[PDB]
C-alpha cells in the first residue's frame, strides 16, 4: 500500500476529487446499467426504507485519462427524491446544493473476482473496496460501493 | 507538485486521516488558542452575520511525530450554534470534525481559495521549513443554508 492507497482506504472525501487530482484529469462517468429495482428485505434495512419500495440501481465506471479508475454501484431510494433531483437521475449534489454527510461503512483490500480482474483490465488483481451512505434530512440518501484498482493508483 | 500536494488542495476528506495515511503515524491535534471575538465589518461579510456578533476563534496544529503537517485556523459564529454543539465547541480539545460527526451534521462546502504560497517568514519559522511553499486553502462549511464555519489551512508542502 503506497500513500495514495492508504489515503483510500481511509478518506471520506470525494473519490472523484482524488482522481481528479492524481490524473490532472477530469473525471468522465460512463453508465453501464440503470434500472429501477424493488428493495428485498437486506437492502430495505440499508437504505432504511420498506421491503419492495423502489430503488434506483446504477452501475458506472469512472475514468480519468482515458482509464477506468472506479467502479461504482450506487443505490438511491426514489422515495427519498425531490422531484427536480429525481427527474436528473455526485455531479447532481453540487448542482442542488445538496447538504448531506457521509458514512463510510467498511473499507478493505482485496482480490479481485477473475470477472472484475478482466472487467478493469488488470494485471495485478488487488482492488481497494469501499461502502458508504450519503445521509440527507437524516436518512440514507444513497449507498455507495466503489472498486479502485491498486495498480491504477 | 505531487499527487498528494494536489489531494491536499481539492479535498473536502479528513486532513487528519489523510495525513496519517501519508506518514503512517497517529497525529494529535493541539488547540493552539481559542477566543472569543467581535465580528468586524470583513468578517461580518465573510460569515454573513452582524457587525458585533460573536465568533469562536480557533488556531490549530496537526502534528504526527513531532512536526506541525497542518495549521488550521477557524471562524465560527457563536449564534449559528445549537447549545450542545456549542458547548462542545467551547470544551475546545474536541476537534471540529468530531464535533460535527457527533451532532450528525448535513453541510456542503464552498471553497474561497486554493493555492500554492509563498509563505512569509514568520510561518515559515512557525512551521519549522527550510523550503517555504506552502498550500493555503479557504473554504466556508454550510449548514442549514448559512455559514458555519469559515476555515484556512496551511499545509508545508515539504513534508508531503
Given at each position: 500500500l503506497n500513500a495514495i492507497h492508504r489515503i483510500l482506504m481511509t478518506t471520506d472525501g470525494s473519490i472523484t476529487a482524488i482522481i481528479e487530482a492524481v490524473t490532472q484529469k477530469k473525471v468522465e462517468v460512463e453508465t453501464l446499467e440503470q434500472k429501477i429495482i424493488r428493495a428485498d428485505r437486506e437492502l430495505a434495512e440499508l437504505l432504511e426504507i420498506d421491503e419492495g419500495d423502489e430503488v434506483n440501481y446504477r452501475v458506472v465506471y469512472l475514468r480519468a485519462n482515458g482509464e477506468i479508475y472506479a467502479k461504482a454501484i450506487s443505490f438511491t431510494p426514489?422515495?427519498?427524491?425531490e422531484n427536480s433531483f429525481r427527474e436528473d437521475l455526485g455531479k447532481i449534489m453540487r448542482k442542488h446544493n445538496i447538504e448531506a454527510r457521509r458514512e463510510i461503512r467498511w473499507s478493505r483490500v482485496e482480490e479481485a473476482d477473475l470477472a472484475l480482474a478482466k472487467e478493469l483490465g488488470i494485471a495485478d488483481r488487488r482492488v481497494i473496496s469501499r461502502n458508504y451512505n450519503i445521509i440527507h434530512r437524516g436518512k440514507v440518501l444513497i449507498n455507495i460501493t466503489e472498486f479502485f484498482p491498486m495498480e491504477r493508483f
Open positions: 426514489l422515495k427519498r427524491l
